Design a protein around this ligand. Structure first.
Ligand SMILES: NCc1ccc(C(F)(F)F)cc1
Length: 330
């Protein structure tokens, strides 16, 4: 079987993408952030403290005939940006774009950090990294992709994120009309639980391609592109007036500048990120300083190929016994 769902940017900057997901019987539809950088399916619920909920749609397990409390199980998770959430665990039926999994662990948030509360467009997260990262204790739980794998036609899902436009998450098949040319596959390391791979180098604008190995993760749940300081300095040096700001927390540039493209390597292939994708707009309303979409990973400890990079490509997450990542131009 297969599934297919439209994903839509939450705002005008593509800060995140939400995808409708049906949970429970009868269906309760929540808009979840599909995150290949984590492995928990957690939702705002009727159990979330009332003061930490501001306009989100909530999951009510008491109204689902198929919901079952997973007795004794708890979860607690903290993201790389400092966000966090925690609560208890139900099992229920979960469907994405026609693809249904029964007995999926649905982690009901009892507490959520402030950054989730002030984001009324995101009802929760659907983790798509490897199940070794799932935070349910004492019995670790499988992700939606892992539970659906056996019944999928092909153990793959694809991310086709749009630039200021809706896109598509497909499960179980590769849409050969969604990309141009060939898909270039590259090996994945699962040792840290991430979709971790090695890029073969980079170029800035029309400059020469620098062959260098850049280890990093493919993370639909991270907005920006986080790369080593040497790479990020070489990019921003080509933008007049760009500088790293301590008060802002990253590279900023004059909103009147035009940004060069950024190219990253996938084996022998090249993926070009148009300069417009790197513009994240004024750092504050009315400001003439704009925030850059390519930032240094030095403070993080891992390089992150976030939405800025992934939306320039058609990306295949191949969850075969030997996992691989496929990239195609589109
Ligand atoms: N999008 C999930 C996520 C967030 C942060 C990280 C970090 F910071 F640990 F790399 C990995 C994955």
């Amino acid at each position: 079987s297969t599934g297919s769902a439209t994903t839509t940017p939450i705002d005008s900057l593509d800060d995140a993408y939400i995808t409708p997901v049906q949970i429970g019987t009868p269906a309760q539809t929540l808009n979840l952030d599909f995150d290949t950088g984590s492995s928990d399916l957690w939702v705002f619920s009727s159990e979330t403290t009332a003061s930490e909920v501001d306009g989100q749609t909530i999951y009510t397990p008491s109204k689902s005939t198929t919901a079952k409390l997973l007795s004794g199980a708890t979860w607690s998770i903290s993201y790389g940006d400092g966000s966090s959430s925690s609560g208890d665990v139900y099992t229920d039926t979960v469907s994405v774009g026609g693809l249904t999994v029964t007995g999926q662990a649905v982690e009901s948030a009892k507490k959520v950090s402030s950054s989730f509360t002030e984001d009324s467009t995101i009802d929760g997260l659907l983790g798509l990294a490897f199940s070794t990262l799932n935070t349910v204790s004492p019995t670790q739980q499988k992700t939606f992709f892992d539970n659906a794998k056996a019944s999928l036609d092909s153990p793959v899902f694809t991310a086709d994120l749009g630039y200021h436009a809706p896109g598509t998450y497909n499960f179980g098949f590769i849409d050969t009309t969604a990309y141009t040319g060939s898909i270039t596959y590259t090996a994945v390391s699962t040792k840290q639980g991430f979709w971790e791979w090695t890029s073969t180098g980079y170029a800035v604008g029309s400059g020469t391609f620098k062959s260098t190995s850049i280890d990093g993760i493919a993370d639909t749940g991270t907005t920006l592109l986080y790369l080593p300081a040497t790479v990020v300095s070489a990019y921003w040096a080509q933008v007049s007036g760009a500088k790293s700001s301590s008060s802002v927390g990253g590279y900023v540039f004059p909103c009147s500048a035009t940004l060069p493209s950024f190219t990253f390597g996938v084996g022998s292939a090249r993926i070009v990120i148009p300069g417009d994708y790197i513009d994240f707009g004024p750092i504050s309303t009315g400001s003439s300083s704009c925030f850059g979409g390519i930032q240094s990973s030095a403070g993080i400890g891992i390089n992150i190929f976030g939405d800025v990079a992934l939306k320039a490509a058609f990306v295949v997450f191949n969850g075969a016994t030997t996992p691989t990542l496929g990239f195609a131009s589109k």
